[PDB]
Symmetry: D2
Subunit: 452 residues, 4 copies
């Protein structure tokens, strides 16, 4: 045994599963707003010998020795991170060791807050993320709601926009130590200047969680939260199109000096994490280099055009969009007017190789959602353009109409799901649409390796 | 732009760094006990298209669709995990989504404990890990000590072994809800039976953190913690020789029929409580390594790890070196350098300059910035087909670096003067260059798992 | 030494101080809304041999023996407590061991909540009490804000009333485990039914802290919070006219059964307190017996008439009242229109033997307050009637006019305070008013002993 | 209605209860170590018009006006407190507003600690108080254990004394921020010097809870905790023979000039953090009792308390009774009844039925519902002019009740059968009535501090 045998020869069962997933991605219309297709260059670093290096600590401050190369790799990733977002190294530092987006947020809370200190994020059914402090009326769900005390702020259901006025009102009463400006299902630009004013009034840190829009921020196609935020967290995948990892940007210099650097770094290690994933760090550095190129600005501009073309196409077919439209990479469809819910439509679309996720509309109470979240980054990476996304909406409309007919023939949601598989005419009607969807999607190029 | 260009074509700066690190790993004598060299098969899965799939939730209960293949991969990783450690699926479950070893431990505490509940683990200078509850005398270090109340149990300074009697005494007073039986720097086997007895008396959970010895447990070359522990966490790298990830094993079934209530709490703590989207590429790489851990090849590898560790221990004893707890019974050796005139901080930088990677280790000592001895591991070089004689020559190379450090200590004052002379003195740098020359020449001859150039 | 010597002979220095304070109470116009004059009957029990009995535990469940009499005294106090507020013993229990009003509230929180569980009370400058969870923008002040997580609710500054709508809005976001319906400076009746609806919606306990209005509740001159609250706390002094102690009323029976009794009792002892103060318990029982008499209903009715007469008199002199008037025992005067603040007026009134306390008006930001809280219970106990309180307002008006003239001759507040003592003409003008105030007050009877 | 009618005229039911309790106190032999009989001078201040004054805040910094007289009373109580324990006002301050002993302790924890900070006190069955951090094995009992993390230190079961060595060992591991040197059932003197050394090593606050021995410390008949402790809490009753209230003494001044930071934190925790309006009537009654504690009369009283406690201990030893820790050095005796055939639960109910009030006490035992022996105190009866011979007759009365209980145990099964036969058996109830007859006849002859009929 040498450890140099290929996966194809060593583990054929796992190699086959890799090919099955690769085929599923190539043949499907990927519309999950948080999904992207990572480049082969980054994947080559993700699966590299850098997995074999324990480098606990930070460049120059390592527990072990023999870290001279991974120090260069981590320092280069930091430089490329600051360059990708046009940041002055005298004003901004960055930690590239968070294992993912969720560990990045937990590191910020651990760094800047005491246990049970107060946090305000956008409510989960309103578009906020778990790590912004979600707990139901029955249970603390996110650990951010366990180790810290969270209170959400809400959208204005009439406009579908963040209610910045109610946030200001409630933050004055709740007195949060940190407020999160960042979303998972929000089609509009965040008023970071207004978030900053609220934070300054109540003496709270402003954290910008730009995970969904980080690639758009780097390409300078939407306003940057770095002009207003004290801390900026993000995933390294999603619109950044990198390997799965996290980043913590923090201000340094004159605030009285900023005191984020040492607290943020200490929270990541040794407080929360162990050995860094240097293979992910390198793959992140490869992606950040790509994010600085004119290619990536063209890609991010096309992401905006494709999302607007998808929004326009849906509006012409008689669909309603939460907040009327979109200013970023995703679209929030409200399907309740058309007579279908997000749970039924998401299941029908999934069976025809169209991946979307149901989304709560401002009307419901988190109640099967009557909405759908659609994203452009993944297919735009496959060189989809405006006309291609209009064709995507055509396929979506067929799936919705199939779900409408099954709804008239079924009662509960489980009867709906079972009817899509047991009924013969519905089965073949879905099979025909699935086949037409996959031939269309297979023709587009796919980033990454050929077989896996 | 297609995203299919090679890394060497599209980013030569990063490709050069990848090759330099690969050349550093190939030419060096890796002796860090927590290090290993991942197989190429697992690395091909680690850098795969599985990075492009959000599968929040668990098989059969995802939040998105399109998870049909990653559900098979996650379920296969679970089955391969239960098989690798010879567990009945009716009595044991496993979560394969922890991002690393530290997230695996924090998920267990979040699943089973309320904030500020009490935790007992081996102290960090005594061989424990950070995530077992390490807080100093001026600040709380690990988040284990922030979100929960931790009190350490210590070694017996006369024997170098865990003081199970003092642990039993202090556990009756501290009343912990969870005790961690797991180590980061400990050369002997843990009495999990005595650990279970202490936990059963104070009515605390027994968590086994076998991250350092997971490969040895899977190959059944050392006693398994699963016979006494309710929860077992581990890394997927180190002795398991996989990609960097974590695992949480938990008891299932009957503890009328009073059932175990670990599964739903453990899974919920991992997601949605603590983590976001799983790293499906790591999960597949773990499943590749877990399959290898079931083969007779892996049993022979872990057996060689044990013999190499004892051969390194005996080769050290026969050259005037003291060993904490006398010797070893697992994969590492805790060498005590103070009955030699040198410390762990001085020796590790000398060894690092001759391509020999080790880490300083606190011995059962006086100061802390100059810890006692070193921690040396077997699994890394054993994966490079190292035999007993090969490690005896490694000890030969170590002893030569030890003597160079002892001579530099004679010409230098404090630590900074010691390290500065290693790079500034002409005769010293040339003497280090020669030893590094023969160490690298000796290490390159051995094979290396993974790819060829990266 | 026998321990039977009188205080007059044993400690003349302390006996003189007792007489000095007694004279100060007899000669002063006591307008602090939380003050009353305890009867001699209750004071006789307060300073009795019951101080010499350690009775940790509860009637029948004592740690020690020889508690047969104090068990009868504690059980009688409970029966008189339930009778005073017209409570069915099958529906209500009562703990008579809280050392004061603040220990009573802390016992309820400890009994029903976990550390850092959420609490909503009226903001302190809005009329709420410390023990309802007060913390400034700089510091956790009340231990209720330290061991538990509090968020206040506010008055509507346009009306001076509790903003029940904003409470409902914010309670839905804050998700409190307990909401406090009770005030220290509020001249209106609390909508306990609306508080109950908010609590039922968010699954919170409704605690009614009736300390200021307990005597009014017992006499049935204002609506009772026992019709809507799960728990009711109160002081035993103030409008109840007893010794200083506390009470915790709790529902028992069918809620599914109520589980307040064992948790409340365990929280008082052994969790929080030690040995009960049986001398206070007996003095409380004496007061509760008085609260059941037709005399006490006449007293409480006169308290309402006197407060309304004081409010009407102030309105006729051109004063403004927060919320327009009063429905209970106190009046909230807003002095900012007259050109004087509460801090200046309270100091001038104090020097002429008129005891009031400055009070924040809904306009200020907690800024020397421009308001005054005036209370009727204390002087009503001295047989003050409507015309007597109109004479009190006459004296108050003179003091305000003195403060207005000193304000025109001084700059800072410290210059104002110093001018009232150093300036000769201001000194004698205050001395004349003080003399006229004290002759008027001395003529009225005073509950308690003659000399002390 | 004037509010000036007498209690006997306006509430005869309550007046009768007051007289019955006064008659019970006069006719009984009060042996509870925490009990005492307050002087009439203090009771006249306790039930005074000072109940009618809200004085939230502190002298010179009140929230209301009209506090000119209560400011003098509170300041005089402070001066009398500092004088009673012979403290330099430049080095010690005192808060006289705690409602009782338990509020005084909670105020110190709130002032000096964050929630869930660590606290070490003597375990409750070992002689500690609830407010020192008592939590059982199934639930947290005292709020000390809820809002803060407490770990108990234990007695040496072979000597009955505090195991200062095990306390030093466990304090290095638990790392408490505050250690309480104070007891509720402990017959020996506390080594505050050893307590300060342990606190100085682990860098924890040393709080002395002298509530049981405050009168003995003021009269300088036992060593004072103020020489070693930074904070000292106490009740104002018990040995101090005052009204029920509490005190918090704290170090002031210089610990450049690094000052003590106790005063502002302690005062703020009492008000506005924890308490509302002070009980000015209790504060004045405390000042009356604190003045008495400075007189040579009180020194002779505390000396008699010590001799009466040792006379009661010797009278017990000479009748076949074992004493925890061998004997006593303060005001109480810890009698161990198991080398006699009876338990504390059975003896205390027999003694209670003959007007002899004691309490069961856990001895260094097997069970808990039937604790070992009893706790007997001297200060109560010593205030009734009891001499050494008087307590030797008290032991005579106790021993007679002990023997009646031993005979009832021979005819009964468990505890409920024991207590039921004491009231149901004709010969037993008549034998108890005779002993009660002579106990009450012997106790009534002695004077009683306070009023005559209430
Ligand atoms: N706007 C927005 N859109 C999206 C789309 C994807 N995500 C990321 C995950 C979303 C999420 C996570 C956990 C729960 C959750 O808690 N589920 C169960 C627990 C299971 C159990 O009980 O077994 C519960 O409710 O308890 C949830 F309902 C939803 C987001 C997001 O975060 N925000
Ligand atoms: N409506 C209403 N009216 C009244 C009238 C009397 N009271 C009862 C006490 C009121 C109160 C208590 C504490 C603070 C307070 O915190 N002060 C200082 C601390 C001192 C320091 O710093 O040394 C601070 O602000 O820190 C306060 F400003 C006010 C109330 C009430 O409770 N409510
Ligand atoms: C390695 C190890 C950890 C941490 O693993 P990471 O992958 O670095 O998070 C924790 N505990 C033990 C016992 C370990 O051996
Ligand atoms: C994606 C996302 C996260 C979590 O990222 P993971 O890599 O899944 O941990 C957190 N917050 C926001 C706003 C996100 O978009
Ligand atoms: C008496 C005592 C207490 C409690 O006193 P209370 O007045 O009952 O609150 C606390 N600690 C010690 C050491 C005591 O002796
Ligand atoms: C008076 C009052 C308190 C506190 O009473 P104290 O006896 O001073 O502790 C608490 N809450 C309210 C509403 C009060 O009126």
């Amino acid at each position: 045994w040498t450890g140099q045998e290929s996966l194809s020869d060593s583990d054929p069962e796992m190699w086959e599963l890799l090919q099955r997933e690769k085929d599923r991605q190539c043949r499907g219309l990927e519309l999950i707003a948080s999904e992207n297709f990572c480049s082969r260059a980054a994947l080559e670093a993700l699966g590299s010998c850098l997995n074999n290096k324990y480098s606990e600590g930070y460049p120059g401050k390592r527990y072990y020795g023999g870290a001279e190369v991974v120090d260069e790799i981590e320092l280069l990733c930091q430089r490329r991170a600051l360059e990708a977002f046009d940041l002055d190294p005298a004003q901004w530092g960055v930690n590239v060791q968070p294992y993912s987006g969720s560990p990045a947020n937990l590191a910020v809370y651990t760094a800047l807050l005491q246990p049970h200190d107060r946090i305000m994020g956008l409510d989960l059914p309103d578009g906020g993320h778990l790590t912004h402090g979600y707990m139901s009326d029955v249970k603390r769900i996110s650990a951010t709601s366990i180790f810290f005390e969270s209170m959400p702020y809400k959208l204005n259901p009439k406009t579908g926009l963040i209610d910045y006025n109610q946030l200001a009102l409630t933050a004055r009463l709740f007195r949060p130590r940190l407020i999160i400006a960042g979303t998972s299902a929000y089609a509009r630009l965040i008023d970071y200047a207004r978030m900053r004013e609220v934070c300054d009034e109540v003496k709270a840190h402003l954290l910008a969680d730009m995970a969904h829009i980080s690639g758009l921020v780097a390409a300078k196609v939407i306003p940057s939260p770095f002009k207003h935020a004290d801390i900026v967290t993000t995933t390294t995948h999603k619109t950044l199109r990198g390997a799965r990892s996290g980043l913590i940007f923090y201000r340094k210099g004159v605030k009285i000096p900023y005191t984020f650097e040492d607290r943020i770094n200490f929270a990541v290690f040794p407080s929360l994490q162990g050995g860094p994933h240097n293979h992910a760090i390198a793959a992140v550095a490869v992606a950040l280099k790509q994010a600085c190129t004119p290619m990536f600005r063209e890609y991010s501009l096309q992401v905006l055009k494709n999302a607007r073309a998808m929004a326009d196409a849906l509006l012409e077919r008689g669909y309603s969009l939460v907040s009327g439209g979109t200013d970023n990479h995703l679209v929030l469809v409200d399907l309740r007017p058309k007579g279908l819910d997000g749970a039924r439509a998401e299941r029908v679309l999934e069976l025809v190789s169209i991946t979307a996720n149901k989304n709560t509309c401002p009307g419901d109470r988190s109640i099967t959602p009557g909405g759908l979240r659609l994203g452009a980054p993944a297919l735009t990476s496959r060189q989809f353009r405006e006309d291609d996304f209009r064709r995507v909406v055509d396929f979506i409309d067929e799936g919705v109409n199939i779900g409408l007919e099954v709804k008239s023939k079924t009662a509960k949601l489980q009867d709906f799901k079972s009817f899509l598989l047991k009924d013969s005419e519905t089965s073949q009607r879905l099979a025909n649409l699935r086949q037409r969807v996959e031939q269309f999607a297979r023709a587009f190029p796919m980033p990454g390796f050929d077989e896996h």
